Amino acid sequence: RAYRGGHLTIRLALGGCTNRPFYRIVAAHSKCPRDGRFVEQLGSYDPLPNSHGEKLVALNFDRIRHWIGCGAHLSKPVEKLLGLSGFYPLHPMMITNAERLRRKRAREVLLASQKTD
Amino acid sequence: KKPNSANRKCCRVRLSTGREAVCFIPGEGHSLQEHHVVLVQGGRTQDLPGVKLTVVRGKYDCGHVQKKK
Amino acid sequence: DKVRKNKDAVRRPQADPALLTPRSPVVTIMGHVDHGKTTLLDKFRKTQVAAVETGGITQHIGAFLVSLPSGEKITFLDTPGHAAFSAMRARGAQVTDIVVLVVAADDGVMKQTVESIQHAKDAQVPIILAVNKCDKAEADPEKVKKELLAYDVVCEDYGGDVQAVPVSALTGDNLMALAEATVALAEMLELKADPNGPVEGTVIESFTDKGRGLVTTAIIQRGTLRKGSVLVAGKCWAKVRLMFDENGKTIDEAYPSMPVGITGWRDLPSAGEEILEVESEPRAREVVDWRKYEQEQEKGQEDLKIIEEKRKEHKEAHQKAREKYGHLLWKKRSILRFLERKEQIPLKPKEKRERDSNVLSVIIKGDVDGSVEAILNIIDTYDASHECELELVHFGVGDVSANDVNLAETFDGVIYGFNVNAGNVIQQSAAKKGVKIKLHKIIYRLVEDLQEELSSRLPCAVEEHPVGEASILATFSVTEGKKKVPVAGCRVQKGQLEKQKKFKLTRNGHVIWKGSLTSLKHHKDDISIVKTGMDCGLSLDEDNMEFQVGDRIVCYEEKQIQAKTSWDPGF
RNA sequence: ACAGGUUUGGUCCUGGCCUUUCUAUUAAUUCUUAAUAAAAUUACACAUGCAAGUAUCCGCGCCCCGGUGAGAAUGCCCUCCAGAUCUUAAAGAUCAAAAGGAGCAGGUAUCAAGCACACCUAUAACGGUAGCUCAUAACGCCUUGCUCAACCACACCCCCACGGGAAACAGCAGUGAUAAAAAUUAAGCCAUGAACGAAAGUUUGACUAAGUUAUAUUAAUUAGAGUUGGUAAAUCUCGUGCCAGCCACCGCGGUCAUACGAUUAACCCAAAUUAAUAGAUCCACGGCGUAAAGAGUGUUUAAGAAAAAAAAUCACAAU
RNA sequence: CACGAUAGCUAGGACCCAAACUGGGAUUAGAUACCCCACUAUGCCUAGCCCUAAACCCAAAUAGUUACAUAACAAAACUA
RNA sequence: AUGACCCACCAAUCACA
Numbered sequence A: 001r002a003y004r005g006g007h008l009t010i011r012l013a014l015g016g017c018t019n020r021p022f023y024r025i026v027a028a029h030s031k032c033p034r035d036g037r038f039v040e041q042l043g044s045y046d047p048l049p050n051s052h053g054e055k056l057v058a059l060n061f062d063r064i065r066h067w068i069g070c071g072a073h074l075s076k077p078v079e080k081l082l083g084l085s086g087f088y089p090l091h092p093m094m095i096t097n098a099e100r101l102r103r104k105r106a107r108e109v110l111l112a113s114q115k116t117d
Numbered sequence B: 001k002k003p004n005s006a007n008r009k010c011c012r013v014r015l016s017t018g019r020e021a022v023c024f025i026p027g028e029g030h031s032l033q034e035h036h037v038v039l040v041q042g043g044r045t046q047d048l049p050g051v052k053l054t055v056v057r058g059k060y061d062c063g064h065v066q067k068k069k
Numbered sequence C: 001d002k003v004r005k006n007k008d009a010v011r012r013p014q015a016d017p018a019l020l021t022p023r024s025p026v027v028t029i030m031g032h033v034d035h036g037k038t039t040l041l042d043k044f045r046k047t048q049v050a051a052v053e054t055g056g057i058t059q060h061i062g063a064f065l066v067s068l069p070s071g072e073k074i075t076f077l078d079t080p081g082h083a084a085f086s087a088m089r090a091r092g093a094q095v096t097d098i099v100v101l102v103v104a105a106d107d108g109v110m111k112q113t114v115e116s117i118q119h120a121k122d123a124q125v126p127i128i129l130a131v132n133k134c135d136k137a138e139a140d141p142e143k144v145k146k147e148l149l150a151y152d153v154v155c156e157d158y159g160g161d162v163q164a165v166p167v168s169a170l171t172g173d174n175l176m177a178l179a180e181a182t183v184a185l186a187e188m189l190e191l192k193a194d195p196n197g198p199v200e201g202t203v204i205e206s207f208t209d210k211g212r213g214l215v216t217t218a219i220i221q222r223g224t225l226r227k228g229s230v231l232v233a234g235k236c237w238a239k240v241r242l243m244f245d246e247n248g249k250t251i252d253e254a255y256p257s258m259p260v261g262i263t264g265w266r267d268l269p270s271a272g273e274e275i276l277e278v279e280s281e282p283r284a285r286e287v288v289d290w291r292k293y294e295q296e297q298e299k300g301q302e303d304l305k306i307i308e309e310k311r312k313e314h315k316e317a318h319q320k321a322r323e324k325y326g327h328l329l330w331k332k333r334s335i336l337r338f339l340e341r342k343e344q345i346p347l348k349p350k351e352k353r354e355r356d357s358n359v360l361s362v363i364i365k366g367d368v369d370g371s372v373e374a375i376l377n378i379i380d381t382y383d384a385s386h387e388c389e390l391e392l393v394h395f396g397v398g399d400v401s402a403n404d405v406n407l408a409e410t411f412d413g414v415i416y417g418f419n420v421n422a423g424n425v426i427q428q429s430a431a432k433k434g435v436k437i438k439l440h441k442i443i444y445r446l447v448e449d450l451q452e453e454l455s456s457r458l459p460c461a462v463e464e465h466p467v468g469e470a471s472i473l474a475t476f477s478v479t480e481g482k483k484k485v486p487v488a489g490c491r492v493q494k495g496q497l498e499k500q501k502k503f504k505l506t507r508n509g510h511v512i513w514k515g516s517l518t519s520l521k522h523h524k525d526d527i528s529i530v531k532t533g534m535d536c537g538l539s540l541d542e543d544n545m546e547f548q549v550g551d552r553i554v555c556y557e558e559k560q561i562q563a564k565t566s567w568d569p570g571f
Numbered sequence D: 001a002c003a004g005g006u007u008u009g010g011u012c013c014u015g016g017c018c019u020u021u022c023u024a025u026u027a028a029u030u031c032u033u034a035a036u037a038a039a040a041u042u043a044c045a046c047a048u049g050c051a052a053g054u055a056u057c058c059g060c061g062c063c064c065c066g067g068u069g070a071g072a073a074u075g076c077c078c079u080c081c082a083g084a085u086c087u088u089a090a091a092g093a094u095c096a097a098a099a100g101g102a103g104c105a106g107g108u109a110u111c112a113a114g115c116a117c118a119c120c121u122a123u124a125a126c127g128g129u130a131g132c133u134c135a136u137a138a139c140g141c142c143u144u145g146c147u148c149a150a151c152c153a154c155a156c157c158c159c160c161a162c163g164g165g166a167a168a169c170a171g172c173a174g175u176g177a178u179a180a181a182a183a184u185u186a187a188g189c190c191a192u193g194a195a196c197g198a199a200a201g202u203u204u205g206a207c208u209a210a211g212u213u214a215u216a217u218u219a220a221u222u223a224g225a226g227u228u229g230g231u232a233a234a235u236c237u238c239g240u241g242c243c244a245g246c247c248a249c250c251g252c253g254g255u256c257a258u259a260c261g262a263u264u265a266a267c268c269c270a271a272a273u274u275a276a277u278a279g280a281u282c283c284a285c286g287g288c289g290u291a292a293a294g295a296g297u298g299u300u301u302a303a304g305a306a307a308a309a310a311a312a313u314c315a316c317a318a319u
Numbered sequence E: 001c002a003c004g005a006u007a008g009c010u011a012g013g014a015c016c017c018a019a020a021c022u023g024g025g026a027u028u029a030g031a032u033a034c035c036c037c038a039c040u041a042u043g044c045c046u047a048g049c050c051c052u053a054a055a056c057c058c059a060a061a062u063a064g065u066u067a068c069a070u071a072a073c074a075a076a077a078c079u080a
Numbered sequence F: 001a002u003g004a005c006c007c008a009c010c011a012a013u014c015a016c017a
C-alpha cells in the first residue's frame, strides 16, 4: 500500500510455530509489517541447531549485493549474519560482545576459585 | 392434518427479531406459562400445517423431560 | 450405572483451637423509623449521609468501617426502618456479632423495634439497647425500659445483661459509653477468625456498575481475600479483578469482618448469599454446574407432579369418552360416535382475551438486588385476584434497557424503575411502542403508583338508581309505514321519563323486559322528557313484548362508581 | 455421484422433494491429561490502566505497526507515471497519488430510455456545428469488502470537515447494552520488527513466552452419545390403544406397535455424540406433437449463416 | 413496421331470416336450463376503433438424408 | 338427484449330528 516515506531494507521475517522459530531473510519496504509483504526473498536462516549441530543460513549473494547496490539498508542481525559468513567484516558489536563475554568468564573463574576456598 | 390425528402442544412465542410465531413443544408433558423465555430452533413439524419452529428442551425455562415418577 | 458426583463448595469445618485469631466486631444498628441510626453512623464516621440521602430515608443496607479513639475497628451495618425492608434486616441479623437496638425516648418501643427484637433474638445475637433523643423535652428512659421489660429484654438496671446507654445523636451525649458498651460486650464474646484459610464470606448487596460490571458488597467472615482469587456464590461465580473500598479506594487485601466491594462476577449473586472461595476456574464451573443441575432437578419434580395430574384428568376424559360411548370395534365406534354429535367447545388462541378481565402486566427494574426483593415481596402480598391480576413478567437489576421496553410492549406492561435510569433513546422508543416507564426513588411512592395503576384498570362499579315510574292504561295499534306498532299509553306517577335512559317493564312485581324505547311520543309531538302527570305513548323495539292494561314501567339511569384497589399492602 | 427413497391398483416416461459425503458456528447431552492451531454477535455506548518516543536543547518519529469491514458494485488484471523516501554528483532504487483501458467483474429489464450526458475553432477567449450514452443493457434500484505472499476502504457522526452535532477503545485488556454467539483489567523487551541515537542503548499491549476455551488436529492416562420399520449397520419383553407421542423422506400409533414410552439385546461413532443453521456440491452443450416449452401472421433493422450442386413463372375458391 | 376469425365499441344506413337478453308455454322437488312461441342487442353496408381464439395441422424458418435406429401413444427416424 | 372418512400385500421354515 501507498506510504509516506521509508526505505528499502534487508531484514528477517519471522516464520515459525511456537517455540520453533525460523527466519526468511527478506528485502522489504521499511514501513510494511514484519511477516507481511516483501519485495524479494533473499535467504533463510534457521536458528535451531539441527541433527548435525548446524544452523543453516542461505544467502542469495548475487541478489543481496544487487540490492545493497541500490542502497537498501541492513538490519543489525542481518549484518551480524553476513559478517559471520565473511561477506562483510565482523560487526563491531559482535567483537565487543565477545570481549564482554570473555571478561564474564574471567570473573566467574576467579569467583569460582574464591568460593572454593 | 387429516390422515393422522392427535392434539399437539404448541405455544406462541415472540422472537428476538420481534416477529411473533407459532412454535411446537416436543416430549410428553411440559410446564410452560406466559412470560417464560425459551430457546427455539428450526425443525419443521410435519403434521402441523404452518408450524416451522420447535422449542429446545433443556434450556432456560423449558426443562428436560422428567422420567416417570 | 451413572450417578452424578456431588461436587459443590461446602463451608469448611470449624477452625482448630490453635489458629483462631482476635477478630473484629460486626454491628447492626436496628430499629423503628426516624430513631437516628444514620445520624449515629454519620457522627462516628465524620461524614454526613443523612443530609444527602434521598427523601431523608435509608433505603439500602450498607457496611461501614469505623476506627475509634481506642483503636477499635467496628463494622457497622445500617438497616432501613420501613416495614417493606423486613427481608433486609433479617440478612443483617445473620451476619452480625452484635446489634445496637435504637429506641427513641419520646416514643418508646414500637412495631419495628419489636420486629428487630425478634430478628436478633431468633439469630441468637447479643443486643445493646440505646435510647435516643435524650436532649428532648419529653425524653423518658424509664418508660422505654419498662416497655422493654414487657418483650423479655432485661436492662442493666434490672440485673439483665442487656446494656442500656441513653444517648443524644445530635449533641453526642453518651457516645463514648455506647462505644465502650460495644467494646465490652465484644471482648466478652471472645470473637475469633481464621486469617490463613480460604475465603468464606457473605453478600450484602449486589449491583451493576456501567464501568465495573457486576459488583458485590460483601463482609468477609473468614480468610484473607486477595486479588485474583476465585469466588463462588449461589448459582454464579467470579474471578477477582478489583476489591475496592466504599470511598473508592483500591485495597489489596481483605481480612475477616472487613466490608469489601468485589468486581468480576459473571452473573449477579442473590443478596444474602454465602461466598466460598475455590481453587481454580474449572473447579468454579464444576460447582456452578452442579448447583444448577440440582435446582433444575427439584423444579423438574414439582413440575412432574402438576403434569401427572393434568394428564390423568385428560386420561380420564378419554376413558369416559371411549367406554361410556359403547365400545364394539373402532369403525363401529366411529359410527356410534354419532350419538353425541354436536360438540360445543369455544377456544381462542389470541392474547387480547384477558384485557377486559384487567390484568396488570408489570416490569420491575431496581438499583440493587435488595431493593428489587423488597418490591417483589410487596407484590407477593397482593390478595385480590378477582379485582385485578398482578402479573410480574420480568424483574431485574440495572437501568431500563431496550429488552424491557419490548417485553412490556408485548404484554402491555408498565415498566417500574426504582433508583434507576432511562436514557433518551429508551424513552423515545417506549414513546413509539406505547409503553410507560415510571421511575421512583422512594419505595412507597412506587407502591402508591402500583395501587393507582390497579385501580385505574379496575372494573367500574355500575349502580342503577331510579328516575321515573309510569303505569300503562290503554293499548293502541297504530299503522305507520305498513307496520302495526303496539303503543302503550302511559301515565307518569312518580318521577319523569327520558328518551335516552334505560327502561324496564314490571308486571305485578315481576320484571318482564329490559331495554330502550323506539318511540316516546306525546300528543302528536315527540318529547324527550315527559314530566309527572304527563301522558306518554311508548313503542318498544321488541315486538315480542305484550302490553296489558295494568302494567308498570320503571325508567332507570346508570351512574358509574369508581372503585379503588381492594389490596392494601401491609406496610 | 457408482447412486438411493418417494407420484400409481399396477407399468413406463417426465418431474420435483429428500437421503448418503465434507466443513464451520450455536445448542443439548457427556468430558481425563498434554501439545499445536484458532479464537468470531454487534461501525451501539464505554469506568480504569496501559498501547510513542528518542536525543547534548534543534530535529526526527508519533492509524507505520495494530484495529475493523462501515461504506462502495465497489473492483480484478494491465498501461502510464507526478510526488515522497533512500542512497549517491548525477544515475539508480523502493512505495507509488492523479490520470488512463486490450480483457474480466453481484442480483434485477416489472429500472428502457438518460436529459446536455458531445465535438470543432483556435486562441485559450470570442465564436461555431448539434451532438453524446444505451437491449453487446445506458440511466436506475437492491445486495455486498476482496479475485488473498496480498489488495481496497474507513478512523465518532454530517460521502469531505473549514464549520456543525458534540466530547469518541473498529490499539491491548476490561465493562454496559445487545445477540443463538462469553479468551487475561496478565509477564517481558530475552528474540525478530519498528522509532530515535555517532554510539553503548532506550522505547514499543507490534511481537516473544505464557494464561483461558473440547473450536480443530495429533498423542495416550480417558466412556459417553446417537440409533435399531424402509432408504440405512443393528431388538427383545412389557406399557399405551388414532391417546400419549414419533419422523430427514415414505410414514407410525384404532388391543399381538421390531416405528410411541421403558426394559433386554445389538449397531455405530468415540473424548466426543446428536440436533439446528449456514456453506461446499448441485440445473440445460438438456429439451419444446401428447408432459414445462415453436411465441396468430409476414417484412425489414441490428446481428449472424453463406460453408459443394442448381433454381425466379403459368387450369381452379387471394385481395 | 403492416395485418389479424368470432365476439364487442362508436356513428350513420339496412332488416328477409336467424337470434344472446327478456316475456310467455311446458318440463321438474326446483328449472333463473335442455323442449315450444314471440321479440331485441347482434349477424348486413359505410367509416373508425378493438387486437383476442382449442389464431392447434397443439409438429418454428431454410437446406438436406433414409444412414444409426422402436420408452408409450400419435403424424416413422434424423442431421446442419 | 344423492350415497363422511377409512381398508390392503415389505416376515421367515422343518430335519439330523
Ligand SMILES: Nc1nc2c(ncn2[C@@H]2O[C@H](COP(=O)(O)OP(=O)(O)OP(O)(O)=S)[C@@H](O)[C@H]2O)c(=O)[nH]1
Residues within 6 Å of the ligand: C031, C032, C033, C034, C035, C036, C037, C038, C039, C040, C050, C056, C057, C058, C079, C080, C081, C082, C132, C133, C134, C135, C136, C167, C168, C169, C170, C171
Ligand atoms: N432532637 C433529636 N433529634 C434527633 C436525634 N437523633 C436523630 N434526630 C433526628 O431524627 C431525624 C431522623 O434521623 P435518621 O438518622 O434519619 O434516623 P433513622 O432511624 O436512620 O431513620 P430511617 O433511616 O429509619 S427512615 C433526623 O432529622 C434527625 O435530625 C436526637 O438525638 N435528638
Ligand SMILES: *C(=O)[C@H](CCSC)NC=O
Residues within 6 Å of the ligand: C473, C474, C475, C488, C489, C490, C521, C522, C523, C524, C534, C535, C536, C537
Ligand atoms: C298520547 O297522546 C297519550 C295517550 C295515552 S293515554 C292511554 N296522551 C297524551 O300524550
Ligand SMILES: [Mg+2]
Residues within 6 Å of the ligand: A016, A017, A018
Ligand atoms: Mg504462530
Ligand SMILES: [Mg+2]
Residues within 6 Å of the ligand: B003, B004, B005, D242
Ligand atoms: Mg394415522
Ligand SMILES: [Mg+2]
Residues within 6 Å of the ligand: B043, B044, B045
Ligand atoms: Mg424434527
Ligand SMILES: [Mg+2]
Residues within 6 Å of the ligand: B058, B059
Ligand atoms: Mg443446562
Ligand SMILES: [Mg+2]
Residues within 6 Å of the ligand: C037, C038, C039, C057, C058, C080
Ligand atoms: Mg437511616
Ligand SMILES: [Mg+2]
Residues within 6 Å of the ligand: C266, C267, D182
Ligand atoms: Mg460472562
Ligand SMILES: [Mg+2]
Residues within 6 Å of the ligand: D007
Ligand atoms: Mg401420477
Ligand SMILES: [Mg+2]
Residues within 6 Å of the ligand: none
Ligand atoms: Mg400406493
Ligand SMILES: [Mg+2]
Residues within 6 Å of the ligand: none
Ligand atoms: Mg427422482
Ligand SMILES: [Mg+2]
Residues within 6 Å of the ligand: none
Ligand atoms: Mg459453546
Ligand SMILES: [Mg+2]
Residues within 6 Å of the ligand: none
Ligand atoms: Mg488490515
Ligand SMILES: [Mg+2]
Residues within 6 Å of the ligand: none
Ligand atoms: Mg449503494
Ligand SMILES: [Mg+2]
Residues within 6 Å of the ligand: none
Ligand atoms: Mg519518477
Ligand SMILES: [Mg+2]
Residues within 6 Å of the ligand: none
Ligand atoms: Mg498509479
